[PDB]
Write an enzyme that holds these catalytic residues in place. Structure first.
Site, PDB file in Angstrom:
ATOM      1  N   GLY A 155       5.250 -10.753  -6.906  1.00 45.36           N
ATOM      2  CA  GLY A 155       5.295 -11.584  -5.731  1.00 45.36           C
ATOM      3  C   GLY A 155       6.109 -10.977  -4.621  1.00 45.36           C
ATOM      4  O   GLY A 155       6.191 -11.517  -3.554  1.00 45.36           O
ATOM      5  N   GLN A 156       6.704  -9.839  -4.864  1.00 45.91           N
ATOM      6  CA  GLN A 156       7.524  -9.227  -3.870  1.00 45.91           C
ATOM      7  C   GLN A 156       6.858  -8.094  -3.200  1.00 45.91           C
ATOM      8  O   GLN A 156       7.511  -7.268  -2.642  1.00 45.91           O
ATOM      9  CB  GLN A 156       8.789  -8.728  -4.512  1.00 45.91           C
ATOM     10  CG  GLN A 156       9.429  -9.784  -5.361  1.00 45.91           C
ATOM     11  CD  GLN A 156      10.693  -9.330  -6.015  1.00 45.91           C
ATOM     12  OE1 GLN A 156      11.236  -8.300  -5.699  1.00 45.91           O
ATOM     13  NE2 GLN A 156      11.168 -10.111  -6.925  1.00 45.91           N
ATOM     14  N   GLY A 157       5.548  -8.035  -3.272  1.00 48.85           N
ATOM     15  CA  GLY A 157       4.815  -6.957  -2.627  1.00 48.85           C
ATOM     16  C   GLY A 157       4.868  -5.610  -3.319  1.00 48.85           C
ATOM     17  O   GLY A 157       4.457  -4.603  -2.724  1.00 48.85           O
ATOM     18  N   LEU A 158       5.375  -5.552  -4.549  1.00 45.03           N
ATOM     19  CA  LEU A 158       5.596  -4.262  -5.198  1.00 45.03           C
ATOM     20  C   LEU A 158       4.309  -3.720  -5.821  1.00 45.03           C
ATOM     21  O   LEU A 158       4.058  -2.509  -5.790  1.00 45.03           O
ATOM     22  CB  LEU A 158       6.722  -4.392  -6.239  1.00 45.03           C
ATOM     23  CG  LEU A 158       8.101  -4.775  -5.659  1.00 45.03           C
ATOM     24  CD1 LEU A 158       9.141  -5.103  -6.739  1.00 45.03           C
ATOM     25  CD2 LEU A 158       8.594  -3.652  -4.774  1.00 45.03           C
ATOM     26  N   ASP A 207     -10.523  -7.121 -13.524  1.00 51.75           N
ATOM     27  CA  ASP A 207     -10.698  -8.451 -14.108  1.00 51.75           C
ATOM     28  C   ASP A 207     -11.045  -9.448 -13.007  1.00 51.75           C
ATOM     29  O   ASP A 207     -10.676  -9.270 -11.846  1.00 51.75           O
ATOM     30  CB  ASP A 207      -9.429  -8.888 -14.857  1.00 51.75           C
ATOM     31  CG  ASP A 207      -9.631 -10.162 -15.702  1.00 51.75           C
ATOM     32  OD1 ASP A 207     -10.132 -10.067 -16.845  1.00 51.75           O
ATOM     33  OD2 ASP A 207      -9.264 -11.264 -15.225  1.00 51.75           O
ATOM     34  N   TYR A 224      -7.741  -6.756  -5.133  1.00 53.16           N
ATOM     35  CA  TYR A 224      -8.202  -5.403  -4.831  1.00 53.16           C
ATOM     36  C   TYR A 224      -9.032  -5.347  -3.563  1.00 53.16           C
ATOM     37  O   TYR A 224      -8.958  -4.344  -2.836  1.00 53.16           O
ATOM     38  CB  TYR A 224      -8.979  -4.799  -6.016  1.00 53.16           C
ATOM     39  CG  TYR A 224      -7.999  -4.413  -7.065  1.00 53.16           C
ATOM     40  CD1 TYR A 224      -7.068  -3.426  -6.809  1.00 53.16           C
ATOM     41  CD2 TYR A 224      -7.916  -5.113  -8.265  1.00 53.16           C
ATOM     42  CE1 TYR A 224      -6.111  -3.109  -7.726  1.00 53.16           C
ATOM     43  CE2 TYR A 224      -6.963  -4.801  -9.193  1.00 53.16           C
ATOM     44  CZ  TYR A 224      -6.066  -3.799  -8.917  1.00 53.16           C
ATOM     45  OH  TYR A 224      -5.115  -3.473  -9.828  1.00 53.16           O
ATOM     46  N   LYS A 245       1.258  -4.387  -4.593  1.00 51.37           N
ATOM     47  CA  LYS A 245       0.474  -4.061  -3.412  1.00 51.37           C
ATOM     48  C   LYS A 245       0.898  -2.690  -2.863  1.00 51.37           C
ATOM     49  O   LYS A 245       0.062  -1.880  -2.458  1.00 51.37           O
ATOM     50  CB  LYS A 245       0.627  -5.161  -2.364  1.00 51.37           C
ATOM     51  CG  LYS A 245       0.085  -6.576  -2.692  1.00 51.37           C
ATOM     52  CD  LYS A 245       0.494  -7.233  -4.051  1.00 51.37           C
ATOM     53  CE  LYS A 245       1.969  -7.426  -4.382  1.00 51.37           C
ATOM     54  NZ  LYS A 245       2.126  -8.019  -5.722  1.00 51.37           N
ATOM     55  N   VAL A 261      -2.698  -0.762 -14.302  1.00 48.77           N
ATOM     56  CA  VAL A 261      -1.801  -1.170 -13.232  1.00 48.77           C
ATOM     57  C   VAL A 261      -1.035  -2.408 -13.691  1.00 48.77           C
ATOM     58  O   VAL A 261      -1.629  -3.449 -14.003  1.00 48.77           O
ATOM     59  CB  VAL A 261      -2.573  -1.425 -11.924  1.00 48.77           C
ATOM     60  CG1 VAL A 261      -3.381  -0.212 -11.535  1.00 48.77           C
ATOM     61  CG2 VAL A 261      -3.526  -2.576 -12.088  1.00 48.77           C
ATOM     62  N   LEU A 262       0.288  -2.305 -13.747  1.00 49.42           N
ATOM     63  CA  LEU A 262       1.066  -3.473 -14.129  1.00 49.42           C
ATOM     64  C   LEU A 262       2.428  -3.452 -13.459  1.00 49.42           C
ATOM     65  O   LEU A 262       3.027  -2.393 -13.244  1.00 49.42           O
ATOM     66  CB  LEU A 262       1.229  -3.586 -15.652  1.00 49.42           C
ATOM     67  CG  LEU A 262       2.211  -2.663 -16.369  1.00 49.42           C
ATOM     68  CD1 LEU A 262       2.402  -3.191 -17.776  1.00 49.42           C
ATOM     69  CD2 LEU A 262       1.698  -1.230 -16.400  1.00 49.42           C
TER      70      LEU A 262
END
Lengths: 143, 143
Positions: free
Chosen positions: A87-90, A115, A122, A92, A79-80
């Site tokens: 920071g823009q909710g993307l 991590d 999470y 999430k 996941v990246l």
């Protein structure tokens, strides 16, 4: 399958068409060590789900994928999000649509390995670490 | 692919031919709650590896399986041995041949999720829990 999340407009897709060089560049920006491109390609074709965020003003800006047995288990990997777009909710929202796609396919238990620095991220999505003392384990890891 | 481990002779196989009713019976003996047989069947066809122990004097007496992205990750699920046959090193040998088959396929990182009561069993095989604080997580688990 293909959905606009934001408006430049950010598009979600579960088509799984990822160019391996685009993914390599994205992994570079988040500071990841390179891996063989034929292996990355293999991992994409053999993931149960490959989920992408693209920025069209098309530039790949996020990815998540999962393995699965198509029934009981699915585990989320790689996941990246492009750091310019964090920071823009993307992230999430990427994870939510990943979880929901896996639930849509009736997968009983959704798993990941987190991590330390990203465990709370999470938790806030409904993941729970070491439920009833279950331990995630790796074979001779070199991290 | 098919190998005798012991001599009744106990045979290892990675053919993956498991009858779903045989597997159900084996899960009953170890006290597992039943799951839909069509789902079990789906999980078998879509596992990267299905590894079996049989007792021919053919009776299914053990199983382990894995999911994987064929490149970087493989996660091991549903490891069980007939309780009449436990203590004879057959689980330990099933896991070894599973790990070795996955390494033979060049999978970088082998993972599993371990119940508390069986964590030391996996440690003794080279698994290591929470390497560098990584946490195994499940989405809203009901255990």
């Amino acid at each position: 399958e293909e959905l606009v999340l934001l408006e430049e407009q950010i598009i979600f897709s579960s088509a799984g068409d990822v160019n391996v060089y685009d993914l390599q560049a994205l992994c570079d920006k988040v500071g990841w060590p390179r891996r063989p491109l034929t292996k990355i390609a293999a991992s994409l074709r053999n993931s149960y789900l490959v989920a992408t965020l693209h920025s069209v003003t098309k530039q790949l800006i996020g990815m998540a994928r999962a393995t699965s047995d198509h029934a009981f288990n699915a585990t989320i990997w790689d996941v990246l999000v492009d750091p310019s777009y964090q920071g823009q909710g993307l992230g999430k929202a990427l994870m939510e649509k990943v979880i929901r796609t896996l639930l849509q396919r009736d997968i009983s238990n959704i798993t990941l390995f987190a991590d330390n620095k990203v465990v709370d991220f999470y938790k806030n999505l409904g993941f729970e670490a070491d439920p009833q003392g279950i331990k995630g384990m790796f074979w001779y890891p070199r991290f």
